[PDB]
Design a protein around this ligand. Structure first.
Ligand SMILES: [Cl-]
Lengths: 166, 166
């Protein structure tokens, strides 16, 4: 639908998450992982594994906190997906939003156009299959939480999206 | 609809092609390039460049022969696009079909799943866009010309596709 790398394909741990999103979801929060960057399918599968591993092993979460991840390889990586409440924007925003995270620190870098396309494609695919509302609003992670996520450069770009609302 | 690496991004020569297809197109013909494979955006852009180079510079065509190329990087590379007649299946099929080529040789190799997902998603976007019929039919290159394209491993795969008609 949006050429999503399925969890099994990036060697993900089984989720234990039970809490469900009330589709059709109104909000999208854009974060960065503030993790390593990756620009090949091989490297970006490993980074998704690395991110999930911190969340599950270290923070003791039911799964990677993000609904989806974006690599500089220009592929979307399935996280908790369309139906399961995320852990990415704190308790107010988690239950009423889909969290997508660009894999990297984008304070002093931009994602490549292909990473940006993958995210816009993902969200359309969201609306297409009825997971996101037609009129969904995109928010920066820093617009709902005290953080520099998604990074100054990435935040500047998402500000220009037709669906962005400060 | 969907994510596609635009011509400018893989540094395509300007097309000189003028003949248009009639929407909606009924047939998709799946080929392999029988060339080098690539599994990173950087290598797959270069490879799209190399295929265009052979077609334009050596064969004397107006553009890369295919409507779209599939990389093992999991990205779709824009060729002639949805509206412009290609040069991939000969004078009887070129006027009535969309030509998509997997970059590589699939005689012994199967394309990775992300290359296969990129291909199927592209076709759904063609239907979404009105470029392809809802009831479009998928052909192997070898079903419409005397060739080994799209290679035995890939051919075996596209025969499993819901829209595949020998
Ligand atoms: Cl938790």
């Amino acid at each position: 639908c949006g050429s999503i790398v399925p969890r099994r394909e990036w060697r993900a741990l089984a989720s234990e998450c039970r809490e469900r999103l009330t589709r059709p979801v109104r909000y999208v929060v854009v974060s960065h992982t503030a993790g390593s960057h990756c620009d090949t399918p091989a490297s970006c599968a490993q980074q998704a594994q690395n991110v999930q591993s911190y969340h599950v092993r270290n923070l003791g979460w039911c799964d990677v906190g993000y609904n989806f991840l974006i690599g500089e390889d220009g592929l979307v990586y399935e996280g908790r997906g369309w139906n399961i409440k995320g852990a990415h924007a704190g308790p107010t925003w988690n239950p009423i939003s889909i969290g997508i995270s660009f894999m990297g620190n984008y304070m002093n870098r931009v994602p490549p156009p292909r990473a940006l396309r993958a995210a816009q494609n993902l969200l359309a695919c969201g609306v297409a299959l009825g997971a996101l509302r037609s009129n969904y609003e995109v928010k920066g992670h820093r617009d709902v939480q005290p953080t520099l996520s998604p990074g100054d450069r990435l935040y500047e770009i998402i500000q220009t999206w037709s669906h962005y609302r400060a």
